[PDB]
Amino acid sequence: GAMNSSNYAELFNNDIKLFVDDTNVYRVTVHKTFEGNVATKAINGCIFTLNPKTGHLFLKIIHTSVWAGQKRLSQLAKWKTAEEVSALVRSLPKEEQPKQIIVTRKAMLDPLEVHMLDFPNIAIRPTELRLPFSAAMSIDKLSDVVMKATEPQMVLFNIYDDWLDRISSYTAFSRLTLLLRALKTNEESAKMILLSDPTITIKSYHLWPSFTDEQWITIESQMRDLILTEYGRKYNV
Amino acid sequence: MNTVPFTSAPIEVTIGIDQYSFNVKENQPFHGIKDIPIGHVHVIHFQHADNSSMRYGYWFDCRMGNFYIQYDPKDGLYKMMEERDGAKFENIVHNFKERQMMVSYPKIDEDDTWYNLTEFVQMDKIRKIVRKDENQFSYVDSSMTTVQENELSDPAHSLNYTVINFKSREAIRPGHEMEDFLDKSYYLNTVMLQGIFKNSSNYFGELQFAFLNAMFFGNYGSSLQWHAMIELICSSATVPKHMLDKLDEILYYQIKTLPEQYSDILLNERVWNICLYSSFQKNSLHNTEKIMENKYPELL
Numbered sequence: 001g002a003m004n005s006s007n008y009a010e011l012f013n014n015d016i017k018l019f020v021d022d023t024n025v026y027r028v029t030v031h032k033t034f035e036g037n038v039a040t041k042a043i044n045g046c047i048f049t050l051n052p053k054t055g056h057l058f059l060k061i062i063h064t065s066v067w068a069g070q071k072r073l074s075q076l077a078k079w080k081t082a083e084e085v086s087a088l089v090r091s092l093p094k095e096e097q098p099k100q101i102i103v104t105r106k107a108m109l110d111p112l113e114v115h116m117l118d119f120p121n122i123a124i125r126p127t128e129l130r131l132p133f134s135a136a137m138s139i140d141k142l143s144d145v146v147m148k149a150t151e152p153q154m155v156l157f158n159i160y161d162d163w164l165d166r167i168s169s170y171t172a173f174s175r176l177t178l179l180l181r182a183l184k185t186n187e188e189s190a191k192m193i194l195l196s197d198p199t200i201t202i203k204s205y206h207l208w209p210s211f212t213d214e215q216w217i218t219i220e221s222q223m224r225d226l227i228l229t230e231y232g233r234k235y236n237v
Numbered sequence: 238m239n240t241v242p243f244t245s246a247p248i249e250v251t252i253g254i255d256q257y258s259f260n261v262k263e264n265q266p267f268h269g270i271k272d273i274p275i276g277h278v279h280v281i282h283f284q285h286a287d288n289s290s291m292r293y294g295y296w297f298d299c300r301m302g303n304f305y306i307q308y309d310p311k312d313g314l315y316k317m318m319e320e321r322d323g324a325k326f327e328n329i330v331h332n333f334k335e336r337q338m339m340v341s342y343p344k345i346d347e348d349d350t351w352y353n354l355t356e357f358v359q360m361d362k363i364r365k366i367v368r369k370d371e372n373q374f375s376y377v378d379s380s381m382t383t384v385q386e387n388e389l390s391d392p393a394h395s396l397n398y399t400v401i402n403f404k405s406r407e408a409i410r411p412g413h414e415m416e417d418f419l420d421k422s423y424y425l426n427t428v429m430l431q432g433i434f435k436n437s438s439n440y441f442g443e444l445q446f447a448f449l450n451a452m453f454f455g456n457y458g459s460s461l462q463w464h465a466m467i468e469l470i471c472s473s474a475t476v477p478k479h480m481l482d483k484l485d486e487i488l489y490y491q492i493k494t495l496p497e498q499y500s501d502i503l504l505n506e507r508v509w510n511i512c513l514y515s516s517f518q519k520n521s522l523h524n525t526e527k528i529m530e531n532k533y534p535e536l537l
C-alpha cells in the first residue's frame with residue numbers, strides 16, 4: 001500500500017527499495033515569441049532514483065534531444081521516466097534489484113507498472129509523504145552535471161556523503177529531507193546557512209560540507225528555523 | 238413456435254422468460270411456457286418467493302432438443318432437463334395446451350428487443366464459456382464467479398469468460414508500453430479479434446452474453462466482463478467502422494432494457510464517462526450517448 005508516517009521505518013530495513021521522483025524530468029522556460037505568443041524551451045532534466053538505506057543515487061540525465069518532435073511532453077515524461085527506471089532495474093544484478101519502487105507522484109504508478117510487467121514481484125507503491133526531492137536541482141553539483149550534459153547520461157552519487165560512518169540511515173534520511181525541504185522553501189537562505197562559515201569546505205567527492213557532528217546540530221537547527229520562519233512569512237504568524 | 242413444459246410448480250416463484258416475468262403461487266396449476274420464438278437463444282430464470290437470494294436460470298435453444306422444467310425437492314430448485322422421447326414430449330405438451338395450463342411468450346409483433354439483445358448469442362457458442370457438456374441448456378446463477386475472478390474457487394462452476402487485463406503482457410507489446418496502454422488497438426484488433434475471438438460477431442456475442450447475465454442474475458463478474466469489453470473498444474483509436482456502428486446499436490438496446498432502479502449497481506460510472514466523453518470513440522456512439530443522457534444523467 002501507500003507509504004506514510006505510520007510505516008516510515010520500513011525505508012531503513014534490509015529489503016532493497018528505491019524512491020523515484022520525476023519532478024525534474026521535463027523542465028522548461030516559458031517565454032514570448034516575436035509575435036507575442038508564448039512558447040516553451042526545454043532544458044536538461046533528470047530522474048531522481050534514490051536508495052534511502054544506502055544513499056545511492058542513480059541520477060539519469062534527460063537531455064533535451066529526447067523531446068525533439070514529440071507531442072504531449074508532460075505525459076511522455078512520465079513514460080520516459082518509467083522506461084529508464086525499468087532499464088536501470090534490468091541493468092542491475094538480480095541480488096541488487098529492488099523489492100519495491102516508491103514513486104513520489106501518483107501519476108507515475110501506471111507508467112511504471114506497465115514498464116515493469118516483466119518484474120511481477122517488484123511492488124510499485126505510492127506515498128502520502130510530501131517529500132522535497134524536487135529541490136535536488138538546488139544541490140550545486142547535481143545541477144551542474146545536468147546542465148552540462150550534451151547527451152543522455154547516468155551519474156552515480158551517494159547523497160549522504162560519508163554520513164553513514166557516523167549516523168544511521170534513518171538519521172541520514174531525516175537530515176537529507178530537512179536540507180531539501182529548506183532549499184525548497186527558501187533556496188537563498190538555505191544556501192547561505194550551508195556556506196556561511198568559509199572554513200568548512202565541500203570535499204571534491206562530496207555534495208555537502210564537511211560539518212562536524214556538533215556543526216550538523218547547529219546547521220539542522222538553522223534549517224528548522226528557516227522552515228518555520230518562511231512558514232511565517234508565508235502564512236503570517 | 239416451441240414450448241417448455243413444467244412438471245409442476247410446488248414452491249412460489251417469480252419466473253422470467255427473456256425480458257418477461259410472472260409470479261406463480263405455491264402449488265398453482267402452472268405447466269409451462271408456449272409460443273417461444275424459434276431462431277434465438279432464450280433464458281428461463283427463477284427467483285424464489287422465500288429466498289430472493291440466488292436468482293438462477295437456464296440458457297437454452299429449442300432447436301437443439303425438447304426441454305422441460307421440474308422442481309427438485311432435494312436440491313431445492315427448478316431444474317431444466319431434456320426429454321429424449323419425442324412422442325412422449327409432444328403428447329405432454331399437447332395435453333397441457335389443451336387444458337390451457339401454459340402461459341404464452343408475450344411477444345408484441347413490432348418488438349425486436351430480444352433479437353437486438355441476442356443478435357450474436359448462440360447455444361453452441363455459450364457452452365464455450367459455461368462448461369457442462371452433458372447438457373444442451375446452460376445453468377447460470379447470481380453467485381458464479383469468472384475465471385479471472387478466480388485468479389485474484391471451484392473450476393467446474395465458473396464462467397469462462399475471455400480474460401481482459403489492460404496491465405498485462407498480453408495487452409502490452411514490449412517496447413510499445415506507452416503506445417499500447419494509451420491506445421489499445423493492438424490488443425483489440427490483433428490479440429483479441431484476430432487472435433482469440435476470430436471475428437467481431439464473437440466479440441459482440443460474448444459482450445452481449447456478459448450483459449444479459451449481469452442483468453438477469455445480478456452476476457457481478459459478468460458486469461465486469463461487459464464493461465471491460467466496452468472499454469477495450471472505446472479505448473482503441475483504430476476500430477472498424479462497422480464495429481463502431483454495431484456497438485452503438487448493441488449498447489443502445491442494453492441501456493434501453495435495463496431496469497431504471499438497477500442502474501446504480503449495474504452501470505460503472507468511470508467506464509461510461511470515459512467511454513462517452515473522453516475516449517477515442519467519444520463521438521462514435523450517438524444513439525447510446527443520447528439514451529444514456531436522457532435516462533441516466535445522474536451517473537454522468
Ligand SMILES: N[C@H](Cc1ncc[nH]1)c1ccccc1
Nearest residue numbers: 362363365434439442443446
Ligand atoms: N465463445 C463466444 C465468443 C468467444 N470466442 C472466443 C472466446 N469467446 C461466445 C459468443 C457468444 C456467446 C457466448 C460466447
